[PDB]
Amino acid sequence: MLEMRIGHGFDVHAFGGEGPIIIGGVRIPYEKGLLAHSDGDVALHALTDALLGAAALGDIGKLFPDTDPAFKGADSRELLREAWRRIQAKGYTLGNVDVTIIAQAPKMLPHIPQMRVFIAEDLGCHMDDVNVKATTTEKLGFTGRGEGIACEAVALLIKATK
Amino acid sequence: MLEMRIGHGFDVHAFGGEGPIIIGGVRIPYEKGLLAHSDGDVALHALTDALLGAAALGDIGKLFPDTDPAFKGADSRELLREAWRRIQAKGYTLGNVDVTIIAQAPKMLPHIPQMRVFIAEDLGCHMDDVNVKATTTEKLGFTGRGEGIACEAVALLIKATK
Amino acid sequence: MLEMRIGHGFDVHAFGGEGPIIIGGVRIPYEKGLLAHSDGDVALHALTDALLGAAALGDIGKLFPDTDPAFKGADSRELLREAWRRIQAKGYTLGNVDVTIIAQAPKMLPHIPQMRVFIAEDLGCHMDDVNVKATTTEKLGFTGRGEGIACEAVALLIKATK
Numbered sequence: 001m002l003e004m005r006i007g008h009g010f011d012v013h014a015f016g017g018e019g020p021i022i023i024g025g026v027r028i029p030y031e032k033g034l035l036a037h038s039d040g041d042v043a044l045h046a047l048t049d050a051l052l053g054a055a056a057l058g059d060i061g062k063l064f065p066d067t068d069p070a071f072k073g074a075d076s077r078e079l080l081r082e083a084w085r086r087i088q089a090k091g092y093t094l095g096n097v098d099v100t101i102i103a104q105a106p107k108m109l110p111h112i113p114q115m116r117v118f119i120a121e122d123l124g125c126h127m128d129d130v131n132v133k134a135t136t137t138e139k140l141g142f143t144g145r146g147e148g149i150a151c152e153a154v155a156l157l158i159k160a161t162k
Numbered sequence: 163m164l165e166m167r168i169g170h171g172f173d174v175h176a177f178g179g180e181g182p183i184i185i186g187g188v189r190i191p192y193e194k195g196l197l198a199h200s201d202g203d204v205a206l207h208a209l210t211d212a213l214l215g216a217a218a219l220g221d222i223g224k225l226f227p228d229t230d231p232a233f234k235g236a237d238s239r240e241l242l243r244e245a246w247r248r249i250q251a252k253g254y255t256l257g258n259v260d261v262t263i264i265a266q267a268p269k270m271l272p273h274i275p276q277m278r279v280f281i282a283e284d285l286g287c288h289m290d291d292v293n294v295k296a297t298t299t300e301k302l303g304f305t306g307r308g309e310g311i312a313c314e315a316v317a318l319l320i321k322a323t324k
Numbered sequence: 325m326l327e328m329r330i331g332h333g334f335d336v337h338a339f340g341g342e343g344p345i346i347i348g349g350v351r352i353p354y355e356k357g358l359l360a361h362s363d364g365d366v367a368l369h370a371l372t373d374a375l376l377g378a379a380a381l382g383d384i385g386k387l388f389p390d391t392d393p394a395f396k397g398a399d400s401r402e403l404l405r406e407a408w409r410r411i412q413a414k415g416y417t418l419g420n421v422d423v424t425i426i427a428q429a430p431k432m433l434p435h436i437p438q439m440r441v442f443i444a445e446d447l448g449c450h451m452d453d454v455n456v457k458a459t460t461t462e463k464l465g466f467t468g469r470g471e472g473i474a475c476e477a478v479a480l481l482i483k484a485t486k
């Protein structure tokens with residue numbers, strides 16, 4: 001008995017105050033920062049949700065409530081590793097993941113290798129199983145007007161029974 | 163010969179008039195309702211499309227035309243079961259599904275268990291094979307301004323030949 | 325050793341000037357055209373990214389830079405076949421693809437069969453492995469206001485080792 005499972009995640013955060021932003025674990029210089037209870041790290045959030053979705057464990061909002069102040073300013077990589085620990089406790093292993101950052105700016109391409117390192121590390125997998133890409137929406141929408149950043153992820157999990 | 167197949171669906175409806183809304187089959191109280199030829203049930207629509215997409219049967223607009231008044235006010239669960247019947251007639255069985263509601267409001271979390279019951283029932287599967295989650299877009303976009311609700315779904319089908 | 329891999333792609337282009345638009349390789353009559361370095365063909369772009377994502381080869385922006393004028397006005401089908409050649413050189417074969425055009429107008433349904441022919445041809449597969457669908461966002465958003473067209477795609481690749 002070998003089971004394969006598909007998952008999908010989507011997240012948005014608004015720009016706010018200032019600092020760098022944090023995306024896929026990488027600190028990226030930018031005129032403004034991300035408003036969140038959190039890292040605001042939309043890439044890891046969308047990814048975490050894709051993983052929980054494939055395991056039918058719900059999503060980050062269920063596992064890590066807005067209400068609990070133990071998650072205020074939390075490293076989104078902590079959340080990813082925690083979510084992943086539980087996924088593994090139900091007997092799943094990683095097939096592969098693919099992430100799509102939707103942002104007008106800043107440039108994501110230079111930071112993609114480092115994101116993959118962080119993600120592969122956090123998921124205890126080889127980098128070959130992690131893909132991250134970016135698209136701009138050509139000045140259209142809330143993304144295109146520089147009001148915020150959106151991100152999607154899909155994930156494939158494997159489970160042996162065997 | 164064992165074939166696995168991936169599918170994706172996306173849907174949007176605008177808020178309009180009033181009543182509850184219907185999302186994933188669940189009647190959810192809200193100041194306004196959903197404008198549609200239909201349930202307006204964006205969750206089941208996006209899901210139905212994910213399923214038809216994986217089976218290469220097109221989408222709901224092809225199977226259930228806007229033009230046909232036999233679908234006016236139709237229970238979107240009827241459409242889901244009908245779409246699923248045809249999917250099964252081509253020899254597919256369910257692997258798993260994952261759904262992402264994108265809405266500023268109302269709160270989706272309390273209603274998610276009941277949605278999963280409805281979906282699992284409609285697809286003749288165990289609840290373990292159905293995941294539903296929600297994300298807000300933090301007041302950004304048409305979703306964030308409370309103008310409507312969007313939803314995504316991914317699906318994995320299996321086919322034995324064998 | 326048999327490996328299955330999931331990928332996701334998303335693209336947007338703004339309407340601009342005039343002419344037909346090109347979507348999934350098909351020339352579709354419309355009051356306005358698509359602004360791009362390219363075909364502007366959002367369907368094939370989102371699809372190309374889904375395929376590269378599953379193979380962990382990045383995305384079109386990495387393979388085919390905005391900076392290189394060898395891609396100005398390029399047939400997006402050339403890019404798809406090139407991206408696919410490289411995917412195959414890493415030893416992958418096609419499982420299936422599913423595409424979702426998000427557009428208020430023009431009507432996509434009549435052109436879907438011809439898109440599938442083009443895609444199946446370009447990917448050297450049977451049409452049964454290619455699905456394309458469309459959704460409108462009911463006048464909501466940049467899509468709903470006729471400012472541009474968005475598209476999503478998911479893809480499943482197979483690799484034998486064996």
Ligand SMILES: Nc1ccn([C@@H]2O[C@@H]3COP(=O)(O)O[C@H]3[C@H]2O)c(=O)n1
Nearest residue numbers: 061265266267269270271296297298
């Ligand atoms: N319309 C919505 C939108 C989001 N949600 C869930 O609320 C959680 C709040 O914290 P989170 O980390 O953003 O995850 C959110 C969704 O689970 C929800 O229940 N209904």
Ligand SMILES: Nc1ccn([C@@H]2O[C@@H]3COP(=O)(O)O[C@H]3[C@H]2O)c(=O)n1
Nearest residue numbers: 223427428429431432433458459460
């Ligand atoms: N730009 C678009 C958008 C949507 N469509 C299809 O039209 C169908 C109308 O009813 P439906 O149930 O929304 O599904 C729609 C798409 O199939 C389309 O053909 N072109």
Ligand SMILES: Nc1ccn([C@@H]2O[C@@H]3COP(=O)(O)O[C@H]3[C@H]2O)c(=O)n1
Nearest residue numbers: 103104105107108109134135136385
């Ligand atoms: N915020 C963004 C958005 C897009 N990108 C990448 O830039 C590339 C430009 O050409 P392309 O064909 O649109 O692909 C883009 C993304 O790879 C990026 O690096 N950062």
Ligand SMILES: CC(C)=CCC/C(C)=C/COP(=O)(O)OP(=O)(O)O
Nearest residue numbers: 141142302303304305306312465466
């Ligand atoms: C599943 C997904 C990704 C849904 C998109 C949700 C979002 C709020 C889009 C509307 O904003 P917009 O930027 O497209 O339009 P506008 O700027 O006019 O509000």
Ligand SMILES: [Mg+2]
Nearest residue numbers: 152314334476
């Ligand atoms: Mg999407």
Ligand SMILES: [Zn+2]
Nearest residue numbers: 011040042045
């Ligand atoms: Zn988030």
Ligand SMILES: [Zn+2]
Nearest residue numbers: 173202204207
């Ligand atoms: Zn609908």
Ligand SMILES: [Zn+2]
Nearest residue numbers: 335364366369
């Ligand atoms: Zn493009």
